[PDB]
Amino acid sequence: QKTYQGNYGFHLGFLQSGTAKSVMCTYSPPLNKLFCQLAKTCPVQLWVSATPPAGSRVRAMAIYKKSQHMTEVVRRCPHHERCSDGDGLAPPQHLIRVEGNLYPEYLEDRQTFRHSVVVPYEPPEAGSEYTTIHYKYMCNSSCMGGMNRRPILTIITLEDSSGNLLGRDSFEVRVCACPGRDRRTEE
Numbered sequence: 001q002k003t004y005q006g007n008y009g010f011h012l013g014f015l016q017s018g019t020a021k022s023v024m025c026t027y028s029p030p031l032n033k034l035f036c037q038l039a040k041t042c043p044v045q046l047w048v049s050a051t052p053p054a055g056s057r058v059r060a061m062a063i064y065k066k067s068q069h070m071t072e073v074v075r076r077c078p079h080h081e082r083c084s085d086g087d088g089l090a091p092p093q094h095l096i097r098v099e100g101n102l103y104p105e106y107l108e109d110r111q112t113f114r115h116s117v118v119v120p121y122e123p124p125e126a127g128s129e130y131t132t133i134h135y136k137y138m139c140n141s142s143c144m145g146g147m148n149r150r151p152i153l154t155i156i157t158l159e160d161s162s163g164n165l166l167g168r169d170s171f172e173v174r175v176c177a178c179p180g181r182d183r184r185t186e187e
């Protein structure tokens, strides 16, 4: 999926991490791919060159990477959907959750039925140049009945208060037991 920096120069950034066996979350620049453990927090940085209009919003959605699976809604496997790990906010079917935000909106498209989670866009804290949002993935890439070993992309869209696109970026995700090991192999 093509990026769209748009008028506000929107794009994502990730902390630099290694490939030690015990790392719980690690991003690969060369693959533009995040590797992470099940339900562990992933800080994703939002960068802009100009401040978006007030009331702008940030949406995250998962899609299958491969063309033959791309029309299938990404969702949790039935086992994980029933395992009672809710936070009181996220519906149990949603793969992507946000943490550390008081205003998340868990949404289902009325025509495509795809899931997403939206939070307000906030400018970077004092003496910072990015904004951070903490995402977690609630299923393994290997979940039978769910992603079933199929790679996904996370699409992050910056939207205005009317829901019009302002900017888009994306990254591949692999949710796995040993992110350190798998990044190095895939690399």
Ligand SMILES: [Zn+2]
Residues within 6 Å of the ligand: 076, 077, 078, 079, 080, 081, 138, 139, 140, 143, 146
């Ligand atoms: Zn699962």
